[PDB]
Amino acid sequence: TTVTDCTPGPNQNGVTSVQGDEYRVQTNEWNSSAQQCLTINTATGAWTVSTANFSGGTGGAPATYPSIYKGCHWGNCTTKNVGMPIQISQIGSAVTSWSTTQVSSGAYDVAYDIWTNSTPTTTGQPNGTEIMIWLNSRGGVQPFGSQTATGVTVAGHTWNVWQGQQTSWKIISYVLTPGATSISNLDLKAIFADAAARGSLNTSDYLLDVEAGFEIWQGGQGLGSNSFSVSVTSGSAHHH
Ligand SMILES: [Cl-]
Ligand SMILES: [Cl-]
Ligand code: NA
Ligand code: NA
Ligand code: NA
Ligand code: NA
Ligand code: NA
Ligand SMILES: [Zn+2]
Ligand SMILES: [Zn+2]
Ligand SMILES: [Zn+2]
Ligand SMILES: [Zn+2]
């Protein structure tokens, strides 16, 4: 039940189904051909960056974003107990937990990447909002855009907020302050409400996916995911 995927970027994505295809793990080396290997437990969904040593500057785009997700990434979709796509305004609840393993070397973030879109499906780049949630970072890396709030309270935690404009979507990043290696029962509905209040999210958009992993600029070996869960609910109770 343990698989190792080194699919080289920048144009190939290696995608591994885990936990009955409730989640998928992707190499997603979207900006590099440097060696990157993931080791993935398909029963538990745990994974590790077992081989990586990225080099380059700490500015601009990262080399890679190896990640686990529920929902659709560029048309590659999970198939069990999904709850997405769903219009943000129609979400009943949305909760996630993530436990990570970090290394005190290199330059990276430890981040959720959450996509929204005007229509419920897309084959490519979402056109709504990218919501990032940085549990931690090191090595001097910073979020896209500009810091627009400092030490704000959202969904029971304290954050700095960064907002930016990409070519066809808006980005908002919640930077946990101080950083940590895990988060439990994070209320994404509360995050979405805040992002809408701050002008970064149209709540008529569809939520496409919830991803978590590491944007890596330098290093990367030994970063990992111990456990990951996403629950997005809708509809009413009904048994047959
Ligand atoms: Cl910007
Ligand atoms: Cl689950
Ligand atoms: Na499940
Ligand atoms: Na660079
Ligand atoms: Na980024
Ligand atoms: Na991004
Ligand atoms: Na809530
Ligand atoms: Zn990708
Ligand atoms: Zn906290
Ligand atoms: Zn905690
Ligand atoms: Zn905490």
Author numbering: 2 to 241
Paper text:
GuxA is a multi-modular and multi-functional enzyme from Acidothermus cellulolyticus whose catalytic domains include a xylanase/endoglucanase GH12 and an exoglucanase GH6, representing a unique combination of these two glycoside hydrolase families in a single CAZyme. GuxA on the other hand contains an N-terminal GH6 domain linked to a CBM3 followed by a GH12 catalytic domain linked to a CBM2 on the C-terminal end.
The structure of the GuxA GH12 domain was solved with and without cellobiose bound in the active site, to resolutions of 1.5 and 1.85 Å, respectively. The conserved N-terminal disulfide bridge is present (between Cys7 and Cys38-all residue numberings follow the sequence of the crystal structure), though the electron density indicates that this is partially reduced which might be an artefact of the X-ray diffraction experiment. The active site cavity is lined with aromatic residues that accommodate the substrate without any significant change in structure at the local or whole-protein level—The Cα RMSD between the structures with and without cellobiose bound is 0.166 Å. Glu131 and Glu216 are the catalytic residues (the nucleophile and the general acid/base, respectively), whereas the strictly conserved active site aspartate residue is at position 114. In the case of the A. cellulolyticus GuxA GH12 domain, the leucine at this position probably makes a modest contribution to the enzyme’s thermal stability which, along with the extra disulfide bond, accounts for the thermotolerance of the enzyme. Comparison with the hyperthermotolerant GH12 enzymes suggests that the introduction of several additional salt bridges into the structure could raise the optimum temperature further, which could also be the case for its mesophilic and psychrophilic homologs.
